[PDB]
Nucleic acid binder design. Structure first.
Lengths: 189, 55, 126, 138, 143, 72
RNA sequence: CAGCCACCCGAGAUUGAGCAAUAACAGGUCUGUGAUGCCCUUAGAUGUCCGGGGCUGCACGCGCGCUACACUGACUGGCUCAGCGUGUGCCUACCCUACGCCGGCAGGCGCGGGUAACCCGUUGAACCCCAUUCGUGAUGGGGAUCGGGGAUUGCAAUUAUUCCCCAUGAACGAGGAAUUCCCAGUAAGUGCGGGUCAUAAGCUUGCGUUGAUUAAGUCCCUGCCCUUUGUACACACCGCCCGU
């Protein structure tokens, strides 16, 4: 068996994006008992998607010059809130994780386009890899600010943001960021 | 009475008389392995000391 | 009116009191010179100050002493007189008072100085 | 018997002495279930239960470790265990199941047999780090 | 010993008012010298359970603490562990509470200027005691 | 800024706390502090005391993550 | 085709640096030098024998950097993993440094261990491994702002300069415009070492330890002037030049 942390089942995930399981994978054979395998995917290209996304999380809520070099703390803090989503929604955290990655994942962004002008922006399609990168970045930014200077501890601010982003609820900071991206895509055609 | 008074105060911590062993120069003495030179003489005379650059 | 003392003792008591509890009265200074020992060129300043102290003019201060050496002192026998201490080019005149004990003679030689007075003017804009 | 063929990660290494014993795996006087970080135990039980806890049928494996960093020792202690299992399973017993378990753990990951050649580079002067340089003064 | 209802805002020093919201081992930091590891050690060797809170602060606790802070030799504590060892201008060895008596000792600006000492002049202008060299750099005071 | 919180022992730590923490499904010092208006420090202290009483099920313990669930 | 991109094996399918052209600068160094050019210096010798102050000053402007603003955490302490090195010696005491007694703090004598992978050393180390008050504060993030005392190398710690114990919580709620630096064991966090050295690091130079989403692209607004082009410049645009 290959269950996550030996307690969360991995034979239950359904991405439901027709063909996106090659760019968001927790079932893949690279998915291991723990999300700790040291950094080896960042060297080359399109190898980052071969990462077990649990590792990408435990390294994305791992930032800001106070956490770098403390990866075991990140693995402890992901065990935390994995066993907490195990009880908050009464379901496997991988299901809500794939729901969050399939909804928060942006499609339309706005960028400067042109060789001779600088007046406005143009709508662009954000590829699956960049969309998961910036979605996890928004999730981690919210989870940092939701427990920053606040009495609320980690594994619950992250937990709250994850649950209210996984169901598509717009109350999430990540989902409001997604809506802002979509609306700025509307307003810059 | 300077003949018996000469060299009264032992200046042992200072390198005024223990300066670079080459000439009347200071300001950058290094005692690594007891060189007792400044940077100038060491770098210009490092070929005979045995220190080479292959790093 | 106001009351000043040296923690229950004076120069006379400290002269009578031995160095045993003097070290307990000593803050941290002038103790290890005993263990280290005193060197040469160090026997004339005490004689000179004592000789000056022996004859004190009536209604006049003890005669000025020109000293070029910062001599470490171990006893309060200096207190009660005047000293001409070093400034850098002259000899400045010092009245000794009970603050001398508990402090070193070299701590009365304060000499440090600016260059000149001016403001950021025509030359300096940014 | 010493069929040890290193098993390494960074500057820390492990040597997996293997013999016909009790089936208990020892790490320098302490069981693999209890290691100082108290966090990578699953990383150590991964190989055995991935290939099968039933494989050990009287094999005493003592791994001796030396090097810097605890987590640096791990990924090599388990690599040493996998190497010792490979040596035992290559010395006498068949290869079909050996190739089966090898394919399974190879698709599981790559850091069980072949070492990571990575190592800490030197630092270049004129900066705080090897690649980072000081701030420009305007 | 243990009692749910003993929470009072004020401790008595010189009939002045202090804060009483802090927990034990931290509610007696309101005294100038008591606090830090001093209060920690007196509560540590006071032979009482330290899990108590502000609400369970008994009057016997306060009385024993006041007695222990009056003189340090209750558990043979030397005088230097207090902020005031042998005093200046008097031969005492203890710190005095309230204001107008201890703070009278701190004013140390005129007599050193009599002997033209540097320390007194430095404390006369409110300059640095640690010896922070001042050339142009510094971002405190006028802006 | 201004430190001012509940430090008084009254009908807030036993009543409405021992009568509303057991009935909820997630119990955390932060969760108890937020949902029951109580202080997180005293929440931890009371949770330790009631664990000593033995009326919870503990999964794991940490400085910031002590995992409790209903047992009785 | 030269080559580029993917893939299986393989330790490794771009490991990092010193060498680096022709030719040149009026860029810094005469305060690096027993390598040196008329002026003060012709013994009235800007230290020179002895040596007692000096780049050791206060109102402020984004000069490399420093600990932080906190609950991914300082914090009782549990467990335990480092690698380059540096080390008793010519007007060179002072270098590391295994125990008894004492002394919280540095340190006294001894039996010895060290020219060295023999001695500290198994650098038991150090970051982390989260059982302690901690809960949004002036207390425990933030010793940043007081006076006393033991004292080891230091005749000479005067701005407790440097070895600590008590008390001192100012300011900082991650901070405008302009804006350094960073692609793999890298950035980043983290401590040890060498340089200076009374025993000395907020600096620099090495080392380990822990250790990413950062994109395998374009030339914007940054420089680098390669090709075409114009020239009345060639002292080469800091050029040339017209007129009152």
């Amino acid at each position: 068996d290959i269950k996550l942390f030996g307690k969360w089942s991995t034979d239950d995930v359904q991405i439901n994006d027709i063909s996106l399981q090659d760019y968001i994978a927790v079932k893949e054979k690279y998915a291991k008992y723990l999300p700790h395998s040291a950094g080896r995917y960042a060297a080359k290209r399109f190898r980052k998607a071969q990462c077990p996304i649990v590792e990408r999380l435990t390294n994305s809520m791992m930032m800001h010059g106070r956490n770098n070099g403390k990866k075991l703390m990140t693995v402890r803090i992901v065990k935390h809130a994995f066993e907490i989503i195990h009880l908050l929604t009464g379901e496997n955290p991988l299901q809500v994780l794939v729901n969050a990655i399939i909804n928060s994942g942006p499609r339309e962004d706005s960028t400067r386009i042109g060789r001779a002008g600088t007046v406005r922006r143009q709508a662009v399609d954000v590829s699956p890899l960049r969309r998961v990168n910036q979605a996890i970045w928004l999730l981690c930014t919210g989870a940092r600010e939701a427990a920053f200077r606040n009495i609320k501890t980690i594994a619950e601010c992250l937990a709250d943001e994850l649950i209210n982003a996984a169901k598509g609820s717009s109350n999430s900071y990540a989902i409001k960021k997604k809506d802002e991206l979509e609306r700025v895509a509307k307003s810059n055609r | 009475g300077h003949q018996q008074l000469y060299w009264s105060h032992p200046r042992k911590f200072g390198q005024g008389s223990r300066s670079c062993r080459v000439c009347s120069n200071r300001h950058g003495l290094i005692r690594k392995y007891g060189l007792n030179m400044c940077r100038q003489c060491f770098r210009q005379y490092a070929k005979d000391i045995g220190f080479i650059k292959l790093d | 009116f106001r009351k000043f003392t040296y923690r229950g003792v004076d120069l006379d008591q400290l002269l009578d009191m031995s160095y045993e509890q003097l070290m307990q009265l000593y803050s941290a200074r002038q103790r290890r010179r005993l263990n280290r020992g005193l060197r040469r060129k160090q026997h004339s300043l005490l004689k000179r100050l004592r000789k000056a102290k022996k004859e004190a003019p009536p209604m006049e201060k003890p005669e000025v002493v020109k000293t070029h050496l910062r001599d470490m002192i171990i006893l309060p026998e200096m207190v009660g007189s005047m000293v001409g201490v070093y400034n850098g080019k002259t000899f400045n005149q010092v009245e000794i008072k009970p603050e001398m004990i508990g402090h070193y003679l070299g701590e009365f030689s304060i000499t440090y100085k600016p260059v000149k007075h001016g403001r950021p003017g025509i030359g300096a804009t940014h | 018997q010493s069929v040890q063929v290193f098993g390494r990660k960074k500057t820390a290494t492990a040597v997996a002495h293997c013999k016909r014993g009790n089936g208990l795996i020892k790490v320098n006087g302490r069981p693999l279930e209890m290691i100082e970080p108290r966090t990578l135990q699953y990383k150590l039980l991964e190989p055995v239960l991935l290939l099968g806890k039933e494989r050990f049928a009287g094999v005493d494996i003592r791994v001796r470790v030396k090097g810097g960093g605890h987590v640096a020792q791990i990924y090599a202690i388990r690599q040493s265990i996998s190497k010792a299992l490979v040596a035992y399973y290559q010395k006498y017993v068949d290869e079909a199941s050996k190739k089966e378990i090898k394919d399974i753990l190879i698709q599981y990951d790559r850091t069980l047999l072949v070492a990571d050649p990575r190592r800490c580079e030197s630092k270049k002067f004129g900066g705080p780090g090897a690649r980072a340089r000081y701030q420009k003064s305007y | 010993l243990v009692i749910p209802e003993k929470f009072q805002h004020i401790l008595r020093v010189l009939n002045t008012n202090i804060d009483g919201r802090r927990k034990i081992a931290f509610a007696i930091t309101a005294i100038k010298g008591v606090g830090r590891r001093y209060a920690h050690v007196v509560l540590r060797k006071a032979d009482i359970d330290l899990t108590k809170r502000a609400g369970e602060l008994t009057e016997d606790e306060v009385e024993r603490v006041i007695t222990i802070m009056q003189n340090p030799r209750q558990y043979k504590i030397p005088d230097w562990f207090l902020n005031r060892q042998k005093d200046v201008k008097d031969g005492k060895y203890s710190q005095v509470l309230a204001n107008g008596l201890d703070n009278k000792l701190r004013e140390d600006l005129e007599r050193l200027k009599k002997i033209r000492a540097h320390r007194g002049l430095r404390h006369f202008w409110g300059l640095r005691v640690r010896g922070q060299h001042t050339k142009t750099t510094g971002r405190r005071g006028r802006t | 800024d201004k430190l001012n919180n509940l430090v008084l022992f009254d009908k807030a730590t036993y009543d409405k706390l021992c009568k509303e923490v057991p009935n909820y499904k997630l119990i955390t010092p932060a969760v108890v502090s937020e949902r029951l208006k109580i202080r997180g420090s005293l929440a931890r202290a009371a949770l330790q005391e009631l664990l000593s009483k033995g009326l919870i099920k503990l999964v794991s313990k940490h400085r910031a993550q002590v995992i409790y669930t209903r047992n009785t």
